[PDB]
């Protein structure tokens, strides 16, 4: 059922049955004041009905104003609800492919995972623990970084799937080959690591102190272009549908949402900068390294890290140090080429520059697959 609105858009009314103390199997995140259906979990009523979609904004549920609520309030609320739930939604503008037959993939884990030790887990309640040798039934890989799975030997009636890390096949030894950086085709320098470790600062210090060499990939946005902005260099200003289409078409390295608009750095954006003879400078979330490495961009990833816990206390609010060091225990993937321990910006910058400069004269080891 759909209802047109005077000022806003057309809303969507769906009805899903809810059992007392039994979750629907859908997760919600806050984007500004809005409540957004962010994920549909397999095995719940929400999934079976096929009435809720990722990206659907929840305006009302059974006469209750949902918009404006913290997701913690929405969580407490629906936990105390049952019976027929009438949803009033602003239907998702995302583009999911036509329904494929549920394809299960059975894997064996060669690593231990405890979601309570994971800072990155999107919905902690859904975290699924497993040990080396456990067999996982991966029901959904729609989210490359978070697979929905059941663990074989899970004695409790689940009934919902769990979330597990979507790691690529990391071998014990990965075959490597030397790659010389061409004179006119610089490798994109890409920075990763915790937030407040001066990463954004080191970028701008490079972009400014050596303006002639470095450049930035022109990102895309759904935000309407402003007065003193140019449609070429500031952003590629596109409609939301175009952005959503590009997302589905795997055209984005990384994309996020800011103030009810989408922003993202396209693969072509970087490939264009490479072709200019300039060094593309780009900060990414560790999560987005998967999409990045799978393209022929030949990136050089530098990990930017804070010092030890004790040395962090010397330089120093309290909730920040806990967050950094927690992210540092998870750096074991080691997709990066080199790490920089930022204690002093000036000391970190010179080391950063020295690393970037060295690419001109000295060849580097890349996965052999990049050259073949």
């Amino acid at each position: 059922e759909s209802i047109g609105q005077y000022g806003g858009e057309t809303v969507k009314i769906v009805r899903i049955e809810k059992a007392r103390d039994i979750p629907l199997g859908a997760t919600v995140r806050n984007e500004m004041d809005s409540v957004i259906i962010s994920r549909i979990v397999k095995g719940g009523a929400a999934e079976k009905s096929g009435l809720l979609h990722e990206g659907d904004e929840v305006l009302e549920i059974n006469g209750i104003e949902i918009r404006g609520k913290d997701v913690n309030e929405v969580f407490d609320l629906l936990s105390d609800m049952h019976g027929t739930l009438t949803f009033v939604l602003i239907p998702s503008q995302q583009i999911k492919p036509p329904p494929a037959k549920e394809t299960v993939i059975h894997v064996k884990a060669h690593f231990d995972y405890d979601p309570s030790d994971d800072p990155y887990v999107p919905c902690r309640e859904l975290g699924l623990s497993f040990q080396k040798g456990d067999i996982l039934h991966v029901i959904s890989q729609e989210d490359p970084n978070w697979w929905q799975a059941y663990r074989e030997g899970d004695e409790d009636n689940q009934p919902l799937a769990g979330l597990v890390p979507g790691k690529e096949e990391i071998l014990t030894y990965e075959e490597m080959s030397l790659y010389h950086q061409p004179a006119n085709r610089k490798r994109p320098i890409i920075l990763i690591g915790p937030q407040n470790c001066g990463q954004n600062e080191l970028r701008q210090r490079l972009m400014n102190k050596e303006k002639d060499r470095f450049a930035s990939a022109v990102p895309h946005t759904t935000r309407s272009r402003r007065d003193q902005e140019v449609a070429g260099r500031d952003y590629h200003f596109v409609s939301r549908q175009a952005f959503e289409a590009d997302i589905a078409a795997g055209k984005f390295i990384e994309h996020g949402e800011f103030e009810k608009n989408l922003y993202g750095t396209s693969i072509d954006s970087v490939r264009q900068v490479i072709n200019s003879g300039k060094i593309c400078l780009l900060s990414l979330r560790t999560q987005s390294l998967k999409t990045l490495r799978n393209s022929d961009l030949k990136p050089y990833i530098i990990f930017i890290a804070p010092p030890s816990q004790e040395r962090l206390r010397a330089l120093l609010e309290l909730r920040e140090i806990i967050e950094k060091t927690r992210e540092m225990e998870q750096n074991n993937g080691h997709y990066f080429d080199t790490a920089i321990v930022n204690s002093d910006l000036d000391k970190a910058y010179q080391e950063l520059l020295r690393l970037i400069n060295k690419l001109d004269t000295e060849p580097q080891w890349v996965p052999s697959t990049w050259l073949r």
């Binding site: 979750p23 629907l24 199997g25 859908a26 997760t27 919600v28 995140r29 806050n30 984007e31 962010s38 994920r39 979990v41 997701v71 913690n72 929405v74 969580f75 629906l78 936990s79 990155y120 999107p122 919905c123 902690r124 309640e125 859904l126 937030q195 954004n200 701008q204 972009m207 930035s216 990102p219 946005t221 935000r223 500031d234 952003y235 990384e254 994309h255 996020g256 949402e257 800011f258 103030e259 608009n261 922003y263 993202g264 750095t265 900060s283 990414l284 979330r285």
Partner: peptide, 18 residues
Amino acid sequence: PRLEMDNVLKPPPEERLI
């Protein structure tokens, strides 16, 4: 610098099960 692009670098909103 682009103010918006520095924001999207921050960790995504936490989810919660309904």
